[PDB]
Every structure is written in C-alpha cells, then in structure tokens.
C-alpha cells in the first residue's frame, strides 16, 4: 500500500493534496476518502493535540486529535 | 489544551507515549483516548497511506489511513 505526506488541505470544501513518498505526482485527497478504521490507533511520528488529565497511569493524553 | 508528537505506540495492547511539544513529561496515550471527530479531516504535515485511483479530479488518494 502506497504512502505519502499531506502537503496542504483546506477545510472549507474539504480536500487537499498529498505528496507521494516514493516519487510521483501530487494526489487530490477529499476528506470523504478517509477510512475511519485507519485512524483508530496512533502511529509513531504522528503529530497530535490533546487534553491533559491525571488518570490511573498518571499524566495522560485525553481527547486526542490530529494536529 | 496542548500538542505533541507520538513518540512510540504498541498496536497489540493498544497504548503508547506522546512527547509534548511545549516541553514537559511524556504522556500515556491509550487508543480509546482518540476522539474520532478529531480525524475526520486531513492536516498539513500529516503522514498518510492510501490507495491510488483515477477519479474526476484525476489521480486521487483513496482509502486514506494514518502511516
């Protein structure tokens, strides 16, 4: 499965462009193209925003979102 | 509240640690802490994996997931 970095994205009409990693031309990416199963976990390197809260494991990230 | 980068995560037991951006101690991040509303859009700089497919806008990213 191919990979790449999101180059830019406007929330108004809900799409952006992805630069593919292994070379090639930029891809159009509509928000509706997001597979929600693809984001049920967190990934190494992934930038995220969150609330900070004290839980059982101590200081923890709540309400995690993409940043 | 705050932002940060996911430093390390383990898909088996479903938890990892986030290093906060604006200084501080690393935070425990369980996958159930993920707010799905937080990922319905794509973010600038976000690393993603995808199918490639020809749609109306031309070459497009399909089935987009976090990478």
UniProtKB/TrEMBL annotation, chains A, B:
SUPFAM superfamilies: Nucleic acid-binding proteins. GO terms for molecular function: nucleic acid binding. GO terms for cellular component: cytosol. InterPro entries: Cold_shock_CspA, Cold_shock_domain, CSD, CSD_CS, CSP_DNA-bd, NA-bd_OB-fold. It is found in: Cytoplasm. One of its GO terms (biological process) is regulation of gene expression. Residues 1-66 form the CSD domain. Keywords: Cytoplasm. It comes from the Bacteria. The keyword Secreted does not apply. PANTHER family: COLD SHOCK DOMAIN CONTAINING PROTEINS. This is Cold shock-like protein CspA. The lineage of its organism: Bacteria, Pseudomonadati, Pseudomonadota, Betaproteobacteria, Neisseriales.
């Amino acid at each position: 499965m191919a990979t790449g970095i999101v180059k830019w994205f406007n929330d108004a009409k809900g799409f952006g462009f992805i630069t593919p990693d292994e070379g090639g031309e930029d891809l159009f990416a509509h928000f509706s193209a997001i597979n929600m199963e693809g984001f049920k976990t967190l990934k190494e390197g992934q930038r995220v925003s969150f609330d900070v809260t004290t839980g059982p494991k101590g200081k923890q990230a709540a309400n995690i979102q993409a940043a």
